[PDB]
Structure 1
Amino acid sequence: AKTRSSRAGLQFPVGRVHRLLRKGNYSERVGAGAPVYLAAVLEYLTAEILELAGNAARDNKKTRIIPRHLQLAIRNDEELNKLLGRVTIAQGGVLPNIQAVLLPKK
């Protein structure tokens, strides 16, 4: 017995994704490729975020990813920020950003 994940070359669970598609009332039927494709897409986006969040941890002299790092990764990347524009990361805070006109003159 081989898993569909291992056949597809994936860490994300093809079988589970299939079931979650069946029992979510998305359609009467589900093609065999669909859970594979979907699982790979979700794995890909997960890798992308964990890549940039890891880097943000590294930059702050840390080996454990926290929500702050996820927030920094997401909001400093133009594409992830757009994808997640209507989403709040709990315990994320905001990007350091001060409007120019508020900086002291002399």
Structure 2
Amino acid sequence: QSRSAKAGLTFPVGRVHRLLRRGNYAQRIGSGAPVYLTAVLEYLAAEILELAGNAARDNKKTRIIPRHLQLAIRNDDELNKLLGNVTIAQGGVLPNI
């Protein structure tokens, strides 16, 4: 058995734990912190990737592309607050009317 396996999360929480270790965020790394934040990250990735799926459906290209990613993330009004100053590579910009 593995900690990354029993976590039931895609991203390996062991990697997150040791990243927190070398990241100097504190002297001890609470074992629930990496798994919790890994799950939060996985949900946010799920948001981006269900947007990817429906953008692939809308644009008829089965595999998601950065244009679709930029368009969907810029249409995500609440998420743009998190990613306001953020910008995406090769994504262009959403059309202004």
TM-score range, shorter chain: over 0.9
Give 5+ residue unaligned stretches, structure 1: 99-106
Alignment partners' CA distance in 1, 2:75 and 2:26: 37
Alignment partners' CA distance in 1, 2:48 and 2:80: 11
TM-score normalised over the length of structure 1: 0.86
Give the C-alpha shift of residue 8 in structure 1. 2.1
Which has the higher Rg, Structure 1 or Structure 2?
Answer: 1
What is the aligned-residue identity percentage? 86
Corresponding residue of 1:10: 9
Alignment of 1:1-106 (within 5 A): 2-98=1-97
Give the C-alpha shift of residue 6 in structure 1. 2.3
Alignment partners' CA distance in 1, 2:95 and 2:78: 19
Contact in 2 for aligned 1:12/1:39 (Cα 8 Å): yes
TM-score normalised over the length of structure 2: 0.93
Give 5+ residue unaligned stretches, structure 2: none
Instruction: Name the amino acid aligned to 2:76.
Output: D
Alignment partners' CA distance in 1, 2:73 and 2:61: 18
Runs of 4+ in 1 over 4 A off after TM superposition: none
For residues 56-86 of structure 1, the C-alpha deviation after alignment (integer angstroms, 9 at most, x for no partner) is 1210111011111111111111111111111
Contact in 2 for aligned 1:49/1:74 (Cα 8 Å): yes
Contact in 2 for aligned 1:54/1:69 (Cα 8 Å): no
- Aligned-CA RMSD value: 1.0
Contact in 2 for aligned 1:53/1:72 (Cα 8 Å): no
Higher strand share: 1
Contact in 2 for aligned 1:4/1:15 (Cα 8 Å): yes
